[PDB]
Amino acid sequence: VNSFSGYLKLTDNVYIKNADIVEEAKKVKPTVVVNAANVYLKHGGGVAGALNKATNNAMQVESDDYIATNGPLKVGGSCVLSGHNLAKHCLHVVGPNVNKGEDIQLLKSAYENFNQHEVLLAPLLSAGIFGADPIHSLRVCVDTVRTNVYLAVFDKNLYDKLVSSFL
Numbered sequence: 647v648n649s650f651s652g653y654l655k656l657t658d659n660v661y662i663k664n665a666d667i668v669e670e671a672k673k674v675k676p677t678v679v680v681n682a683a684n685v686y687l688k689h690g691g692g693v694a695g696a697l698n699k700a701t702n703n704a705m706q707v708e709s710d711d712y713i714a715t716n717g718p719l720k721v722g723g724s725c726v727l728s729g730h731n732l733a734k735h736c737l738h739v740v741g742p743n744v745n746k747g748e749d750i751q752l753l754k755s756a757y758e759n760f761n762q763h764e765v766l767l768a769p770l771l772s773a774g775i776f777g778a779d780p781i782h783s784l785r786v787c788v789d790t791v792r793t794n795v796y797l798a799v800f801d802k803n804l805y806d807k808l809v810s811s812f813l
């Protein structure tokens with residue numbers, strides 16, 4: 647039993663909800679919140695920009711130190727950093743950005759990072775400003791993640807379309 651509330655159960659391990667991931671994180675304080683990161687951990691917009699704003703830019707400060715030490719992530723890769731006031735940890739995961747020409751096959755690799763964590767609150771990778779089809783992203787998530795994933799979907803219209811079209 648965990649503290650996630652009001653989710654629709656999609657499969658054995660995947661749950662979905664129409665919710666702002668920022669407000670969901672602040673209420674649940676999950677062990678792991680997933681950020682829709684880029685390789686430079688520059689959290690300017692989308693889910694990343696919103697999560698960082700909620701940390702009063704502490705996420706960005708921590709991220710800049712991480713990059714200065716380690717260099718950029720790989721597309722499809724991840725790193726674990728602090729969750730600040732939102733979660734114990736933030737798993738920064740880089741899904742491919744279609745608006746940069748990045749290979750969509752890397753979306754499966756991106757979701758594989760979730761399997762290193764027993765329970766996660768996450769957005770749909772490569773959705774929103776990353777330019778991929780959120781329906782496809784959900785399919786890859788379901789077919790790749792084996793740990794317990796709670797998806798927060800910001801747009802109510804998109805949430806209903808995801809549910810109604812789910813196979």
Ligand SMILES: Nc1nc(N2CCC3(CCC3)[C@H](CO)C2)c2cc[nH]c2n1
Binds near residue numbers: 770772
């Ligand atoms: N669950 C959730 N998702 C977010 N994003 C941003 C927009 C897209 C649609 C294009 C990509 C995704 C929809 O879920 C993911 C945000 C941003 C702020 N808060 C959020 N909360």
